[PDB]
Ligand binder design. Structure first.
Ligand SMILES: O=P(O)(O)OC[C@@H](O)[C@@H](O)[C@H](O)CO
Ligand SMILES: O=P(O)(O)OC[C@@H](O)[C@@H](O)[C@H](O)CO
Ligand SMILES: O=P(O)(O)OC[C@@H](O)[C@@H](O)[C@H](O)CO
Ligand SMILES: O=P(O)(O)OC[C@@H](O)[C@@H](O)[C@H](O)CO
Lengths: 262, 263, 262, 263
């Protein structure tokens, strides 16, 4: 069924995770035809500035994520940054996420595939849609069986990303496709010390994604984005999540009749 | 508001071709009463890549052919102009005067179109940013235009390729009605060397995206037999497929409409 | 010999043209191994804003340009915007310039070629280097014998241009190549009502052009760019023209040994 | 200041290959005394497009091979790291630790390199704007790096293509020494499908542009027989052509140097 990956960008505290997890659990009960996966990074290993928030470490993160899965019975997903992290993360993560900048790092992909867990690779901003075929092949070689590719924008001049929706049907040829609705509108290094983005385009573009056809969507959501320690300009207010989900489900219901085969 | 569907053969290959397509558009106009159809065809392809490619049979012949379509089917008409002097004779038949993408910044062409009193539709240049169109609309208003459209037809993305940045739709809506060009947006500029190429398999998915995001109309080139077209043979939609596409976009528009943001 | 096309962007007044023409005449006498061509537009037909400076009309412009050619004996070049302008402009213009946005307008190219004059086409920001082969063919079909292609940057994301220097050797296969040193650093619509640009990159990039190899350079020059009615952010101060010319001639002298054949 | 020339075979195909190339680099180092040569070769291509492409013979073998080059020829050494743990063993032989382009934002990798006390050269990501490198240098300085280089190797321009924006050289010079990668800048990412392509005919002209604009050094992959290389077979410079290229860039650098702007 349709996948909805959502949660706060970074694990600012297990408290934050629980509050968001409580809402995702509620929507999970309201939208039975949707498979929700809770997401949150234990480390922002690629911040632009050395002085920006990274996190509380892998152990605290994996612990907080365990709390969410045990308390709400929600599937989990988080990203890894170096090969050694795959094993400990797989203890809780149902889906191991591979960062966009690291989508070509062979050992990271193999490490993730070896855990036996599902793997979701963020398509690098430097990659062409057809270049992802090789990515999937590495994962299959590594033993991965459940593989996802996430569209999160492509480099378009400086400090800007564009979403080429032709990528959805192209990547669908070799993997399930997820559309990252929040990172696709961010402006890389847009604010000098941090990245920017236009929240006003999150909804319009997610509607486009389901109209074109995808297997799921990815959304960063925070109770108060303004106070977020990461992606404060792009995380979706928690309260607006329900409305957006219902909206894309309705559009998908009507549009699905026209999704092209393979 | 009434959704606009601008459709027709890319170029006026013959008056016979126009009537053939016009007959089908008229039929669909009777079925899709909630749609405002505008028949489109260029009397001249003034910017072909090669000197050896088809251009047309001249303005006189073209306007005459377009007038036959309006007279026989009662359909609104739109065609593009390339130089200022063409605005006047074209306004005689064209309900909407179209400004080519490469010429979207040519002040005199825009002014010539605006003073005719007809509606003006400007194809957004492949070199233009969405917010850059505000000044285009300003020039038109200055010139007397009261009904203005801006058409999204892709942006230069590396060589011989265009990308559609859908953020352009809500941005341009701030100052004009917005049209999505479903066929030119998938063309590969100069892709075939002496001519441009294209990927027809992406026409439908991208048009679904356009209506889900929200626009005021769509623009589609359509030909009975695309493979035999004298221009854009790789991107024109087979006429037989037009009905189905229109029905689909009306359905997606309806379900997504309650979510369209207010500008 | 090496071509240097220079002059004020727009014909703000025949007075401005004479002052600039006087300096270009002086450099012409100092650099005998260089063929100088005086340039200035009688009309800026593609300004972003309807309220920006366009010019004083074709007649006044052609007249002022005649004054420059007669008073200083300098070759002339100006751009045309519609087919009817080719004939009257050819009365004075040694080289007819075709605007970047209009490089694909067949009738404009043919009109220019019919005059018997040399034709310099600005490569559209939307054109690939190899797409210019067709441009030259149209001109040859139209009777043109002296044909130039000018590199002036390519669309790179929004409101920015990048100079792909690979274009120089590619275009050289079918025409003489000119590098536009001033427009290549302009930021299209950068200031909302007008375009922007970084003057600091004019010199570095022109050095690159001659190191790679070209048949000439194009430079907008004004006594006081700050007061210019067009491209105030990119026109080169008249006083700096001599130094730049000597510099590129020196670099060309050494680098020419390595220019690849054809 | 002494111009830097970083050169060597893309990958450590064998210790024999390294000595062969090292011998030539040593010879040129004796002729071009005004140049500081640094021998380069990767012990691992950790980011090949295909799982079936050559990667290397491991870190242990590679460091040993590089040490043989330094020992036998007295040349400085540089190689790239892919994960934090590799910094320490690599620092034992590498005078300059290289950070791959895709990993230019990985904080721990940069920190691991900085604390070794060795010089660090970061390949500018194809996704990074020139001014975005200021923060890269800041992280390195924070981590203890005292000798920092930023390498221009092209920027994503549409699909499977890179463009070199030479404005990056003077911009990056504001906070670090700048190196121009003459061979990777002409490669076509994923161009050959299972591997990347490239246009060797543009290597020389673009390197001439780099020195005319002004940089602190150049980076060139060089192999005795490029067509037989196990990586970048389409872009590595034939070893026989290295001498001529170096002489040419030194000549162009000399004549253009009086015009280099002050940062
Ligand atoms: O704000 P900066 O530090 O640029 O980081 C961008 C974040 O969006 C980043 O860590 C993201 O999740 C990774 O690409
Ligand atoms: O096939 P070529 O001649 O490149 O022309 C492309 C057509 O698509 C052309 O007339 C177009 O819509 C105009 O820009
Ligand atoms: O400043 P704006 O009006 O954008 O004009 C850009 C000028 O550089 C322009 O007329 C140029 O000479 C044409 O492209
Ligand atoms: O040929 P493929 O595997 O695409 O690899 C490209 C090489 O050019 C590669 O290892 C490169 O410099 C790394 O990014």
């Amino acid at each position: 069924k349709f996948l909805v990956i959502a949660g706060p960008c970074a694990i600012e505290s297990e408290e934050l995770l629980l509050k968001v997890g409580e809402e995702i659990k509620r929507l999970s009960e309201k939208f039975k035809e949707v498979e929700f996966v809770f997401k949150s990074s234990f480390d922002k290993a690629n911040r632009s500035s050395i002085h920006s928030f990274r996190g509380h470490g892998l152990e605290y993160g994996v612990k907080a994520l365990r709390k969410v899965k045990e308390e709400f019975g929600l599937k989990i997903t988080t990203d890894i940054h170096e090969s050694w992290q795959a094993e400990p993360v797989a203890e809780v993560a149902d889906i191991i996420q591979i960062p966009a900048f690291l989508c070509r790092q062979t050992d990271l992909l193999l490490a993730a595939a070896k855990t036996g867990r599902a793997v979701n690779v963020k398509k690098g901003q430097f990659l062409a849609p057809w270049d992802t075929k090789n990515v999937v092949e590495k994962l299959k070689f590594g033993g991965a069986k459940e593989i996802y590719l996430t569209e999160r924008g492509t480099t378009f001049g400086y400090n800007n990303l564009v979403v080429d929706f032709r990528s959805l049907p192209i990547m669908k040829q070799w993997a399930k496709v997820i559309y990252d609705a929040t990172h696709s509108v961010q402006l890389p290094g847009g604010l000098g010390d941090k990245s920017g983005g236009m929240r006003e385009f999150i909804f319009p573009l997610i509607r486009a994604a389901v109209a074109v056809g995808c297997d799921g969507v990815f959304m960063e959501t925070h109770p108060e984005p303004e106070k977020a320690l990461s992606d404060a300009s792009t995380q979706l207010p928690l309260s607006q999540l329900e409305g957006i989900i219902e909206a894309i489900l309705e559009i998908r219901e009507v549009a699905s009749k026209y999704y092209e085969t393979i």
